[PDB]
From a paper:
Human ATP:cob(I)alamin adenosyltransferase (ATR) is a mitochondrial enzyme that catalyzes an adenosyl transfer to cob(I)alamin, synthesizing 5′-deoxyadenosylcobalamin (AdoCbl) or coenzyme B12. ATR is also a chaperone that escorts AdoCbl, transferring it to methylmalonyl-CoA mutase, which is important in propionate metabolism. Mutations in ATR lead to methylmalonic aciduria type B, an inborn error of B12 metabolism. Human ATR is a homotrimer with active sites that are located at the subunit interfaces.
Author numbering:
A (entry chain A), B (entry chain A), C (entry chain A): 78 to 130, 142 to 240
Write the structure that this text describes.
Amino acid sequence: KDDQVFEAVGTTDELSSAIGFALELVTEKGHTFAEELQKIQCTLQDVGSALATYTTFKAGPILELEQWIDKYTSQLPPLTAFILPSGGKISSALHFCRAVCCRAERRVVPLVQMGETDANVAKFLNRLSDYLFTLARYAAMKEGNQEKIYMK
Amino acid sequence: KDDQVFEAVGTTDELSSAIGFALELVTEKGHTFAEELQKIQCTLQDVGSALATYTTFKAGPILELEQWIDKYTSQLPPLTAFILPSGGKISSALHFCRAVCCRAERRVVPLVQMGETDANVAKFLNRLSDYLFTLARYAAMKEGNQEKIYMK
Amino acid sequence: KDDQVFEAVGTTDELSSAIGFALELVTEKGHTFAEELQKIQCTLQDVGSALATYTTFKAGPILELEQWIDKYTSQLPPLTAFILPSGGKISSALHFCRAVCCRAERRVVPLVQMGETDANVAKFLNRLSDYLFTLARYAAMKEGNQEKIYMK
Ligand code: B12
Ligand code: B12
Ligand code: B12
Ligand SMILES: C[C@H]1O[C@@H](n2cnc3c(N)ncnc32)[C@H](O)[C@@H]1O
Ligand SMILES: C[C@H]1O[C@@H](n2cnc3c(N)ncnc32)[C@H](O)[C@@H]1O
Ligand SMILES: C[C@H]1O[C@@H](n2cnc3c(N)ncnc32)[C@H](O)[C@@H]1O
Ligand SMILES: [K+]
Ligand SMILES: [K+]
């Protein structure tokens, strides 16, 4: 069980660090959501502390992510298909963050199952992966980059 | 077995997203193989669908990768030694993609062993890791960056 | 046991490749520690060879990392708190490298436990994660970027 905790906190750290690099690309251009990614890094620090102690993890950050998801989704065109992860430098970095966030979620789920950590931790990471997907699309749109949809 | 499928599709996604970021660095310079990386992202979407359904996975993309590997290898100097992963921004990003692709292959192999997915999926990822290695060397060469070989 | 070796050598490779990309960002600016990261890539090649053969792994590189850690730590302000992984492009890329290095260490530890590889390999990766943390802080400081500390 302690192996699983080290894996979970390590991959949360890998996620926060990948977001840190994406944040650098954002502040360099004229994007205003850098502060949202920085706030997420603070919550990921609290996630790491919660995994390592089970402990309480409030649902406040989950509802905040849901609010941001709604805000960006309502500015995007309809989408009912997978997109190629691309869309510009910021968008592609956010899709990498998104995939790492899904990997962190996979490491947290067993801990939730064994009752070792709050289920809200896994739900936060689940919403974060949707936030990162939506934010990538938003950045690509704001940069005038076309959303690429493969079907065959 | 369902844990293994989520791990395999997640790491395929992580691979396609890392390639998306490398693709951004490519289109920014005067490199012409951006369309090859984009085609690979489409096949990786088909890989994800095949892992998630076992299902048929044609060998067409494998032979196409083998053709591209031959095309680039025949323009490179001889190499019988490990290189330091570097060679410029594009080349170093492709070596990271290459390592992630090997990790995706490690997640797919157990599914092939249990008969749960087509062996052609693992062979595609195996050839992709050779393609990404060769493409990194090619990008480094086209940029005039020296191939670094450590021996001691 | 052979699955574990492939996982360990693959994640060492992923680490060296991530360092290669960080190295590209370093040489682009006026930072002088590019040669230290390149030397680390050479040792990581030797780590891969040691994991794959158990085999001897000298402690020379460990003491060299400890010397470099001391050199940079003695130029930094005191820190008794977690920082948000950021600090500029180079610093944030090094924090990602740091997290990947911790993941490589997690893959090496079981091999050390089963007596299959030298414990010095795990200690090298442990010191490398401290080196990458310290180097990130140093790069951020040299760039005039403020160290971000979240508490709440
Ligand atoms: C396996 C799977 C994945 C895998 C592999 C996907 C792939 N490359 O094939 C991975 C982990 C990579 C993945 C990622 C995502 N997924 Co997914 N995935 C699935 C799944 C389970 C099967 C997909 C499949 O194999 N389809 C077979 C192929 C041949 O179908 P297709 O012709 O491409 O048609 C698909 C699309 O039209 C898709 N679709 C329909 N509406 C929408 C809307 C959006 C925004 C997207 C992206 C897709 C989508 O549904 C069809 C049927 O699968 C479906 C649920 C299901 N059982 O169908 C969810 C599903 C398509 N995924 C979903 C989501 C949310 C996503 C992500 C945005 C998650 C995230 N935050 O990272 C990403 C998007 C990735 C991208 N580049 O666009 C949703 C989409 C609807 C929605 N918005 O609620 C679904 C329907 C699951 C659900 N929530 O109910 N997914
Ligand atoms: C463990 C291993 C790895 C590990 C660790 C490697 C390391 N850092 O030590 C990892 C997973 C990182 C790795 C990666 C790769 N590997 Co490898 N690896 C091996 C292996 C199994 C042992 C290597 C070893 O420990 N040698 C001990 C050290 C001390 O030997 P050395 O003095 O450095 O001499 C080696 C090189 O000269 C090498 N070599 C000979 N010809 C060539 C050609 C090329 C292009 C390269 C890169 C190396 C190479 O062979 C010698 C003996 O190992 C060998 C097969 C074997 N049993 O020897 C394959 C081998 C060297 N790998 C091979 C390949 C293809 C690669 C990759 C290109 C795979 C990919 N697409 O990612 C990368 C290259 C990475 C890089 N930066 O250059 C091939 C090279 C020949 C070829 N082209 O067919 C081999 C021979 C396997 C095979 N296919 O038969 N590998
Ligand atoms: C779980 C854990 C992690 C997890 C999650 C951390 C998190 N986000 O909560 C992960 C794997 C991400 C992590 C990473 C690191 N960790 Co850690 N970690 C721990 C641990 C075991 C518990 C942390 C915790 O949950 N605290 C609960 C929260 C609420 O406490 P807090 O109010 O934030 O107060 C903490 C800080 O003040 C911290 N602290 C005190 N002095 C210093 C100095 C430094 C440089 C740092 C970064 C922190 C630090 O100690 C307090 C108590 O934990 C502690 C040891 C312990 N049992 O306390 C080590 C510890 C804090 N980690 C330590 C280190 C070295 C690090 C890394 C630099 C390792 C590396 N090279 O990557 C990184 C720093 C990451 C960053 N962004 O700053 C050291 C710090 C002291 C030192 N320099 O020796 C400790 C004390 C372990 C030890 N070596 O004895 N860590
Ligand atoms: C969109 C699809 O992605 C798969 N899915 C959901 N969460 C994860 C995760 N953390 N890692 C990988 N795959 C995941 C499910 O199959 C879902 O339906
Ligand atoms: C080049 C060497 O890399 C190792 N190898 C082959 N495929 C993978 C993979 N997916 N992940 C990690 N290591 C791998 C084998 O030992 C091979 O000989
Ligand atoms: C700083 C904290 O990080 C955790 N820790 C130590 N090494 C690793 C690793 N390789 N991967 C993940 N977490 C690790 C321990 O709990 C330590 O106290
Ligand atoms: K992993
Ligand atoms: K960049």
